[PDB]
C-alpha cells in the first residue's frame, strides 16, 4: 500500500529554499524557488543571492541547497527515508571538507509548510584561504553528476552518507569536497530505515539572461538505485 509521506509527493510540489551563510566572516543569504516532481526525480530551481555578490562559488553550495524528491523505484519504496519523515520533516547535517582549504558545516530542516516543501539552512564556513579556490572564485560553473551511497543510522533513527564532489578548477585541476552527512527525523513518528542503496544525481547549472542579481538556475534529476 502507498505510505503516508510518499503520498505528499505524487504530483508537482512547490519548493522554497532559504540559506543563511557565514564563510570566514563573509555573511550572505540565498533564496531559491521552484518545483519538484518526485515521480520523475525532477527539480527545477532558481537561486538568488539576496545580499549582493555571493562570496563563494555557486557550485560549492549545490549539495547544500532536497533528497526527498528522489525517484524511488517501486521495488525500493520501503527504503525512502526522506519522504517517510514528511510532513514533519528531517534535520540534515553535513560537514564538507574542501581539500587543502576550509570546511562548511551545515544544518538544515526540510519539512512541509502547507503545500510547500521548505529547505531552511544555516551554513558556517571556517579556515578558508582568502586566495584559495573557494574565496578566490577559481571554480568552473559546470554540470555536477554523482552517485551517493545511503546507509541506515539505526541508533539515530535516520540515515548517513559520505561522498566526494570533485569541482573543476579553472586551471584544469580538481577541488575535492569530502561530504559527511547525517539525517534524523524532526517528528516522533515512524520512519523507513533503508538497506544500503544509491542516489544518482545529475545537475545542470545555468544563468537567466534577464537576471541582474547574482544567481543560479538548476535543473536536477535524482534517482534511487542499487537494490
- CATH number for the domain spanning 119: value is 2.40.155.10
Closest CA to 81 of 65, 93, 68: 68
Q: Rounded to an integer, what distance in angstroms lies between the CA atom of residue 17 and that of residue 107?
A: 13
Work out the number of other CB atoms within 10 angstroms of the CB of residue 75: 8
Q: Rounded to whole angstroms, what are the CA distances from 184 to 85, 164, 178?
A: 9, 21, 20
The phi and psi torsions of 22 (rounded to 5 degrees) equal: -150, 110
Q: Which domain holds residue 98?
A: 1-227
Residues listed for the chain: 227
Closest CA to 117 of 128, 109, 125: 109
Count of domains observed in the chain: 1
Q: What does the angle CA 107 – CA 37 – CA 167 come to, to the nearest 5 degrees?
A: 50
Q: Rounded to an integer, what distance in angstroms lies between the CA atom of residue 43 and that of residue 13?
A: 10
**5, containing H or E segment:** helix 4-7
- What is the DSSP pairing of strand 90-98 with strand 103-113? antiparallel
Diameter of the chain measured on Cα atoms: 55
Closest CA to 66 of 143, 13, 123, 25: 13
> Strand locations in 61-196, DSSP E?
90-98, 103-113, 116-126, 144-153, 158-168, 174-185
- Helix, strand, coil shares of the chain, percent, nearest 5, are 10, 50, 35
* Inter-residue contact 118 to 16 (CB < 8 Å): yes
The structure was resolved experimentally with X-ray
* Inter-residue contact 43 to 62 (CB < 8 Å): no
Closest CA to 82 of 68, 96, 93, 92: 68
Q: Please name the residues in contact with 147: beta carbons below 8 A apart, sequence gap of 6 or more.
A: 198, 199, 200, 201, 225
Q: Rounded to an integer, what distance in angstroms lies between the CA atom of residue 227 and that of residue 27?
A: 42
Which ranges of 69-211 would DSSP assign to H, the alpha helix?
Answer: 81-84
Amino acid at each position: 500500500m502507498v505510505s503516508k509521506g510518499e503520498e505528499l509527493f505524487t504530483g508537482v510540489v512547490p519548493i522554497l529554499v532559504e540559506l543563511d551563510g557565514d564563510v570566514n566572516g563573509h555573511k550572505f543569504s540565498v533564496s531559491g524557488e521552484g518545483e519538484g516532481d518526485a515521480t520523475y526525480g525532477k527539480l527545477t530551481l532558481k537561486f538568488i543571492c539576496t545580499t549582493g555578490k555571493l562570496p563563494v562559488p555557486w557550485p560549492t553550495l549545490v549539495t547544500t541547497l532536497v533528497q526527498c524528491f528522489a525517484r524511488y523505484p517501486d521495488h525500493m519504496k520501503q527504503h525512502d527515508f526522506f519522504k517517510s519523515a514528511m510532513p514533519e520533516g528531517y534535520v540534515q547535517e553535513r560537514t564538507i571538507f574542501f581539500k587543502d582549504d576550509g570546511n562548511y558545516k551545515t544544518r538544515a530542516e526540510v519539512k512541509f509548510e502547507g503545500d510547500t516543501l521548505v529547505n531552511r539552512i544555516e551554513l558556517k564556513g571556517i579556515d578558508f584561504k582568502e586566495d584559495g579556490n573557494i574565496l578566490g572564485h577559481k571554480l568552473e560553473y559546470n554540470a555536477i553528476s554523482d552517485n551517493v551511497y545511503i546507509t541506515a543510522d539505526k541508533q539515530k533513527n535516520g540515515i548517513k552518507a559520505n561522498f566526494k564532489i570533485r569541482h573543476n578548477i579553472e586551471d584544469g585541476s580538481v577541488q575535492l569536497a569530502d561530504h559527511y552527512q547525517q539525517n534524523t527525523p524532526i517528528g516522533d513518528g515512524p520512519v523507513l530505515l533503508p538497506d544500503n542503496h544509491y542516489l544518482s544525481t545529475q545537475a545542470a547549472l545555468s544563468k537567466d539572461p534577464n537576471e541582474k542579481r547574482d544567481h543560479m538556475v538548476l535543473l536536477e534529476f535524482v534517482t534511487a538505485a542499487g537494490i
